């Protein structure tokens, strides 16, 4: 009974899904606001973790021989796209080739099956390039293409990490990126930019994300799932670019876009760089970002690091800095060595700036273990240049003084803050009214 | 005869630039926001009975709509009149 | 004990008398309204799981 499980449900629900998608592709040809994402969550929940290997009991090995001809496992794969089957069902023509592509890698057995993925991907490549030149008619095959192409060529980029580097992934997708751009965004533009940034960042290469900056703009219809990816990536660009403020802002924007608890790896990655970009501004991160369960024993070292940073004792930070370097490299953020070991003073002078309305240039040095006030004057001056501290400095009498605590409510500031929220709320209303009706 | 009779309800320009009364306007906002709170209190209950027993325009929704409309327009017009008076009259 | 409105400053050795503005109930009503809108927002979060 467990082996016949796909026959009871999966074989018929997948047929119903294909029929429904084709019907939407045939009637109500705007098959872009349909069940595609809602249904394709079934893929990750069930299908890629089921189609991976040539299972018997008609589960995988019996798919193609029963699906051999549709005129109203590679050798078995050749026939569903062959045998004079009707080809107007472009979603069917795409899916019949793309069905093993993601699961075949999801098997990850890596043995002679990497060749299978490596060739089944070029089968899809040939199908897509043949479809592109003929100017396919209006049946949303660009949408069906872009995402599955992104995933499958991501897997082929993993394979090109096993062997010769993944440059080919970029060069092709970039060419498709304009191809997607000149017609319309089928949500493919977002994922193509995301993969373009990912290919740059895997090489830690970054700067030629001149694409990411406004030379070409990111589309607004990224399903909140491409949004999180692109925002994390641009946060990582802006972080090392020494502009930590807007990076932290945009990536705090990004973090809330993740699901409840299913994106544990992505959540870990986002928090992993959010906490450090926050300490780069001297701000101690939030405690709740260390209390999520699956995130404790992963974010624990930087927690200890944070315990080291809320002191002037950078020697304590260094004493345990080398203790976990290899797990910093395994998590791909060890370049923290270049960007924390010297700015640790910034947080200390921050706390002083919070605690003291007025202080002496000697005193600021004493309680964060700095050597001489001649150094402390430069430290506080630097804090002013960065703008992290709103103080003022007067060496003539040894003064470091916070500016006047004026009442803000009797000024323009509350109106400005309320104007931002007015614009936000009216924008929410406008985009809400834009999208009621479709029947 | 049209707009000869209309001069009877015709608003005067001083009536247009009239700034109402700030104490009375504050009292009006005070009352309307409190009414908004009391409407939202049962609007919460109405949304928490979303379960669709015996599928049924009284109370929360449209009343909240008219309240927000009148409050927002009154506040906007008062602020605009005050601002115009501030900048134009000296 | 709030039985008297005024504020001390020892650094000048002085006490100060102020005007005690009347709390302006508008903002408290505002806070209750926005908190209850947060509650109804959680209610809609309970919805939309049916999609």
């Amino acid at each position: 009974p467990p082996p016949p499980a796909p026959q009871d449900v999966e074989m018929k629900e997948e047929a119903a899904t294909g029929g429904g998608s084709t019907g939407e592709a045939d009637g109500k040809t705007a098959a872009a606001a349909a069940e595609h994402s809602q249904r394709e969550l079934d893929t990750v929940t069930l299908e890629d973790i089921k189609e991976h290997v040539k299972q018997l009991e008609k589960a995988v090995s019996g798919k193609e021989p029963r699906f051999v001809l549709r005129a109203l496992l590679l050798p078995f794969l050749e026939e569903p796209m062959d045998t004079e089957a009707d080809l107007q069902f472009r979603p069917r023509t795409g899916k019949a080739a793309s069905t093993p592509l993601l699961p075949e890698v999801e098997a990850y057995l890596q043995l002679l099956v990497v060749i299978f993925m490596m060739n089944s991907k070029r089968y899809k490549e040939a199908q897509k390039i043949s479809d592109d030149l003929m100017q396919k008619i209006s049946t949303q095959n660009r949408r069906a293409l872009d995402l599955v192409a992104a995933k499958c060529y991501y897997y082929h980029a993993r394979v090109y990490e096993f062997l010769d580097k993944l440059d080919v992934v970029r060069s092709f997708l970039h060419a498709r990126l304009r191809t997607a751009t000149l017609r319309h965004d089928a949500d493919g533009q977002a994922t193509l930019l995301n993969l373009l940034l990912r290919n740059y960042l895997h090489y830690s290469l970054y700067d030629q994300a001149e694409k990411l900056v406004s030379k070409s703009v990111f589309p607004e219809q990224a399903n909140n799932n491409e949004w999180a990816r692109y925002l994390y990536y641009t946060g990582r660009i802006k972080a090392i670019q020494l502009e930590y403020s807007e990076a932290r802002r945009t990536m705090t924007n990004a973090l809330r876009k993740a699901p409840q608890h299913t994106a544990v790896g992505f959540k870990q990655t986002v928090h992993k760089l959010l906490i450090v970009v926050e300490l780069l501004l001297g701000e101690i991160p939030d405690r709740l970002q260390f209390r999520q369960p699956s995130l404790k024993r992963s974010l624990m070292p930087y927690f200890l690091l944070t315990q080291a940073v809320r002191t002037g004792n950078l020697a304590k930070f260094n004493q345990v800095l080398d203790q976990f370097g290899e797990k910093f490299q395994a998590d791909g953020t060890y370049t923290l060595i270049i960007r924390l070991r010297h700015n640790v003073i910034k947080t200390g002078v921050r706390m002083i700036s919070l605690s003291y309305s007025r202080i002496s240039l000697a005193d600021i040095a004493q309680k964060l273990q700095l050597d001489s006030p001649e150094d402390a004057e430069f430290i506080v001056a630097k804090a002013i240049r960065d703008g992290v501290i709103e103080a003022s400095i007067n060496h003539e009498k040894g003064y470091v003084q916070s500016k006047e605590m004026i009442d803000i409510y009797s000024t323009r500031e509350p109106q400005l803050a309320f104007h931002q929220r007015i614009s936000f709320c009216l924008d929410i209303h406008n985009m809400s009214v834009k999208a009621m009706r479709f029947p | 005869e049209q707009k000869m009779l209309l001069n009877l309800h015709k608003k005067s320009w001083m009536e247009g630039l009239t700034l109402q009364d700030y104490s009375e306007h504050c009292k009006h906002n005070e009352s309307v926001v409190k009414e908004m709170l009391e409407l939202a209190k049962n609007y919460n209950k109405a949304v928490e009975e979303e379960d669709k027993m015996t599928p049924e325009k009284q109370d929360p929704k449209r009343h909240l709509e008219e309240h927000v409309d009148v409050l927002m327009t009154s506040n906007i017009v008062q602020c605009l009149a005050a601002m115009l008076d501030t900048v134009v009259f000296k | 004990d709030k039985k008297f409105h005024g504020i001390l400053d020892q650094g000048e050795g002085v006490l100060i008398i102020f005007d005690e503005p009347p709390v302006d109930k508008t903002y408290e009503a505002a806070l209750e309204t926005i908190q209850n809108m947060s509650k109804v927002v959680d209610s809609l979060y309970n919805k939309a799981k049916k999609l």
Binding site: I422, C425, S432 | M36, E65, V68 | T33, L44, K50
Partner: peptide, 30 residues
């Protein structure tokens, strides 16, 4: 601010209910 925020909330509430209703009709039609 309060009025606009409440307007946005009610707008979202109409939007979600409209989506639910039309999706219910679509699911029943099949």
């Amino acid at each position: 601010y309060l009025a606009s925020l409440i307007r946005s909330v009610v707008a979202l509430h109409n939007l979600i209910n409209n989506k639910i209703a039309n999706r219910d009709a679509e699911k029943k039609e099949g």
